[PDB]
Design a protein around this ligand. Structure first.
Ligand SMILES: CCCCCCCCO[C@@H]1O[C@H](CO)[C@@H](O)[C@H](O)[C@H]1O
Ligand SMILES: CCCCCCCCO[C@@H]1O[C@H](CO)[C@@H](O)[C@H](O)[C@H]1O
Ligand SMILES: CCCCCCCCO[C@@H]1O[C@H](CO)[C@@H](O)[C@H](O)[C@H]1O
Ligand SMILES: CCCCCCCCO[C@@H]1O[C@H](CO)[C@@H](O)[C@H](O)[C@H]1O
Ligand SMILES: CCCCCCCCO[C@@H]1O[C@H](CO)[C@@H](O)[C@H](O)[C@H]1O
Ligand SMILES: CCCCCCCCO[C@@H]1O[C@H](CO)[C@@H](O)[C@H](O)[C@H]1O
Ligand SMILES: CCCCCCCCO[C@@H]1O[C@H](CO)[C@@H](O)[C@H](O)[C@H]1O
Ligand SMILES: [Mg+2]
Ligand SMILES: [Mg+2]
Length: 758
């Protein structure tokens, strides 16, 4: 509806607030593990946490965190075919640790292998009324409709990866861990894909995508008090993906779709120091969706009936975790800790009922109107469970148990009703396009009536589509964190002597939101250059943070959640591309320059999210100065300037495609909290928290993918590809400890993949 200059460049970029990633572009770009986060790292609206996936943990194949326009990584709406696929149970808890209540999770409900998706669409700004419950952006994964059998093999290993490690981390890295932080010294990645589409009957068919991504990380199974490794074992990390879509083109009026979705993540861990501490930590999501499109003469009606199960779990091998003062395990003699703390889980089931009505285009004088309305109902069943009774204790040689704790078999469930109403009008007069809209959200979890005004306007300045300006104002209200209401039930299962149970105060919370002011320019320079300039301003208000206290008499820790967090972020992007690529001796060259600049100031850390507790600090000492906390730069997802030269080489006679991305990223600042002993500390300001920012290293990263399709074979069935990540083997310090011990980004990495079509 809005006029747009299509992206012919190597890397997709934001057009009118949205970026489209086709399967061609997902396959052409080197995407590592093939998680949606690998696809979106190149987007100028996105910032990753460079301290997350480092030289120390390339074995892990799970999806990574993404910040859109300064928003936190738990504030994005992840959807599959327009249906919510976001894990709102407790996305901030990523800890791989073992405990009675620890469960590792993230915001992505399904860890989807992107190589099976038809396309992925990211909305970063000018987001329409249909999308909601997010503070930063919307990621919409789309499933292919029948239109072919493809087999794909992809592999990599620790031998093909260069690890830049500080000498201080060498021992922990070789063992495979340091307490609850796990490393991947030795690993082998085998990824298998199977995709097919088959017409089953007249106007009826199905598409099925299956993917098994496995990483076998080798660590020490047992480490002694001395630090002596006794043996090594293989810890299976696997993500299974199963996607399927049935389409029945029943008639001119009706079209039916039935979608089956399933992602199975499973990771084996153990505590090196504790014998018999094996545990399976995982995440399982599956669901169904019946879509129906009814075409009438005056309007189009789209209905969706859906069910999704999103879960995370910890399943120890053992049910008892205990400390023997005189060890009876194997040949261990001293004090030893053995076992595990059973099986726990957390889940949310959504029952979705959506409707959208698209009225036919009509005129009121010379002003063209195309309105649309939506109504949605989502029932959420959210729960946490302790599957088996567990115990902990210290036992003496005689058999006397002390410091005994019992974890009781239990389950706690929550029922939530979510409603959505929305309407927008597509207004078009001459060279001006207008889309005014309003979205309404209500839930009985926080019981807040949320009104989101949504407005974007586009002006074709000369009406020849050479200069187009887009401006807009939009409000984005986020979703809920179900842990707040569920944790107390999980903490009540604990029966111990001096254990503080929890009381969580959250029902008076206002829903967190972003106000956005955005301006976009699409400009044709000369005959062959397309230039895109975008500015996005985001004010993040009523951001969730907390404060706590422990009460002795009642033996309770009272956490009171609040809306004290606030950030201001300025986002700028400048892109240059060619309408026509160069042609030299049959080699087609497609070049692109992308500038991305994101500066954010706030009184919180994005990684902390709703668990942030320092928002009550109105003032801080920052780099020797007593300043307002809101004026201080945000400490994470903080590499402000990004400059990229992207270049695709295509030589059809030889069946070769050469994709290259050269990315220069600005150094991030590592925040350090100063103690009274610190040389830079100021006693004058002792009543305030004091921080110093240490700038680290900038990174020049060259990622490449060389794809060969042997021309001798009829139908071009076979394709062999090589991916090289960080070709220059840049050594970049992503993070540093208080002592000065540095964490490094990953070094040169080689990926080999084969695909056969039939
Ligand atoms: C398509 C994938 C081709 C892989 C070719 C082998 C990659 C070699 O990889 C290199 O090997 C060196 C010696 O073993 C190591 O020192 C380097 O760290 C490693 O990057
Ligand atoms: C219909 C089945 C579709 C997927 C086919 C690929 C499954 C690969 O499966 C893998 O095979 C390996 C064989 O060496 C085993 O060692 C692994 O444990 C297994 O996960
Ligand atoms: C998961 C989908 C459930 C619906 C069952 C599939 C019905 C397919 O029905 C098909 O419809 C065609 C007309 O559209 C006819 O020409 C075919 O003979 C008939 O098999
Ligand atoms: C596609 C389905 C469209 C949305 C259906 C809206 C149903 C509204 O239902 C109403 O919700 C109120 C709020 O909890 C309740 O107080 C009322 O008792 C209930 O009937
Ligand atoms: C949170 C308490 C109700 C849980 C849902 C139970 C089964 C569906 O009952 C729902 O009740 C709502 C009223 O609250 C209505 O708005 C819905 O239309 C109705 O489907
Ligand atoms: C078509 C969509 C209809 C649903 C709109 C949401 C109406 C929310 O309405 C609210 O319902 C609560 C009960 O759950 C009451 O406590 C509130 O007083 C009432 O304002
Ligand atoms: C398509 C490009 C649009 C350019 C928009 C104007 C430049 C925005 O610039 C911003 O202005 C703010 C004003 O208070 C300052 O606070 C920011 O530091 C500054 O970066
Ligand atoms: Mg290596
Ligand atoms: Mg309330």
């Amino acid at each position: 509806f809005f006029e747009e200059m299509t992206v012919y460049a190597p890397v997709p970029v934001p057009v009118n607030g949205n970026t489209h990633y086709t399967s061609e572009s997902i396959e052409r770009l080197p995407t590592g593990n093939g998680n949606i986060s690998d696809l979106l790292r190149t987007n100028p609206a996105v910032r990753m946490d460079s301290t997350q996936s480092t030289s120390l943990n390339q074995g892990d194949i799970r999806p990574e965190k993404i910040s859109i326009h300064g928003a936190s990584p738990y504030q994005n709406a992840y959807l599959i075919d327009g249906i919510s696929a976001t894990n709102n149970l407790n996305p901030a808890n990523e800890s791989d640790a073992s405990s009675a209540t620890n469960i590792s999770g993230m915001s992505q409900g399904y860890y989807l292998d992107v190589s099976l998706l038809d396309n992925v669409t990211l909305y970063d700004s000018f987001v329409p009324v249909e999308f909601g419950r997010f503070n930063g952006g919307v990621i919409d994964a789309k499933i292919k409709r029948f239109n072919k059998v493809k087999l794909g093999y992809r592999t990599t290993r620790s031998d093909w990866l260069t690890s830049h490690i500080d000498e201080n981390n060498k021992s922990a890295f070789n063992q495979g861990s340091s307490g609850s932080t796990y490393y991947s010294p030795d690993f082998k990645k085998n990824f298998y894909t199977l995709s097919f589409n088959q017409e089953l009957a007249d106007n009826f068919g199905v598409t099925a995508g299956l993917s098994r991504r496995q990483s076998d990380i080798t660590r020490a199974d047992y480490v002694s008090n001395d630090g002596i490794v006794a043996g090594r074992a293989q810890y299976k990390n696997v993500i299974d993906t199963a996607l399927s879509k049935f389409t029945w083109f029943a008639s001119d009026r009706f079209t039916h779709d039935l979608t089956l979705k399933y992602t199975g993540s499973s990771r084996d861990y153990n505590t090196s120091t504790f014998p018999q501490s094996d545990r399976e930590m995982g995440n399982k999501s599956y669901g169904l969706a019946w879509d129906m499109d009814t075409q009438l003469a005056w309007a189009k009606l789209r209905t969706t009936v859906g069910w999704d199960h999103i879960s995370d779990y910890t399943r120890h091998d053992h049910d008892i975790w205990y400390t023997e003062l005189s060890c009876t395990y194997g040949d261990i003699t001293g004090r030893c800790t053995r076992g595990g703390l059973g099986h726990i889980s957390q889940a949310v089931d959504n029952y979705t009922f959506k409707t959208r009505l698209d009225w036919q285009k009509f005129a009121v004088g010379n002003v063209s109107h195309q309105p649309y309305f939506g109504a949605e109902y989502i029932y959420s069943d959210a729960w946490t469970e302790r599957h088996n009774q567990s115990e902990s204790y210290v036992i003496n040689a005689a058999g006397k148990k002390t410091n005994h704790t019992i974890y009781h078999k239990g389950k706690g469930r929550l029922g939530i009703d979510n409603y959505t109403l929305y309407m927008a009008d597509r207004i078009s007069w001459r060279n001006v396009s207008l889309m005014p809209g309003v979205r309404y959200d209500y839930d009985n979890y926080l019981s807040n009536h949320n009104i989101s005004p949504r407005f974007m306007t586009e002006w074709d300045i000369f009406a020849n589509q050479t200069s187009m300006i887009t401006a807009g104002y939009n409000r984005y209200y986020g979703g809920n964190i179900l842990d707040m209401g569920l944790r107390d039930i999980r903490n009540s299962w604990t029966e111990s002597v001096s254990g503080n149970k929890t009381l969580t105060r959250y029902q008076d919370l206002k829903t967190p939101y972003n106000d956005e002011l955005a301006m976009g320019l699409q400009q044709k320079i000369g005959k062959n250059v397309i230039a895109r300039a975008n500015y996005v301003y985001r004010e993040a208000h009523d951001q969730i943070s907390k404060s706590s206290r422990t009460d002795s008499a009642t033996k309770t820790t009272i956490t009171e959640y609040n809306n004290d967090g606030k950030t201001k972020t300025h986002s700028f992007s400048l892109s240059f591309e060619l309408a026509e690529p160069l042609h030299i001796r049959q080699v087609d060259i497609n070049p692109q320059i992308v500038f991305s600049y994101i500066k954010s100031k706030g009184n919180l850390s994005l990684n902390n999210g709703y668990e942030e507790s320092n928002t009550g600090d109105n003032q801080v000492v920052y780099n020797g100065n007593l300043v307002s906390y809101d004026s201080v730069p945000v400490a994470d997802f903080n590499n402000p300037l990004k400059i990229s030269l992207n270049m695709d080489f295509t030589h059809q006679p030889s069946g070769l495609v050469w994709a290259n991305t050269l990315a220069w990223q600005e150094a991030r600042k590592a925040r350090i909290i100063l103690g009274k002993t610190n040389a830079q500390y100021i006693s004058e300001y002792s009543d305030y928290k004091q921080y110093v920012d240490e700038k680290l290293d900038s990174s020049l990263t060259w990622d490449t993918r060389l794809s060969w399709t042997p021309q001798f074979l009829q139908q071009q069935n076979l394709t062999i590809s090589a991916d090289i990540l960080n070709v220059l083997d840049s050594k970049t310090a992503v993070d540093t400890t208080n002592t000065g011990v540095a964490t490094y980004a990953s070094g040169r990495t080689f990926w080999l993949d084969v695909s056969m079509k039939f």
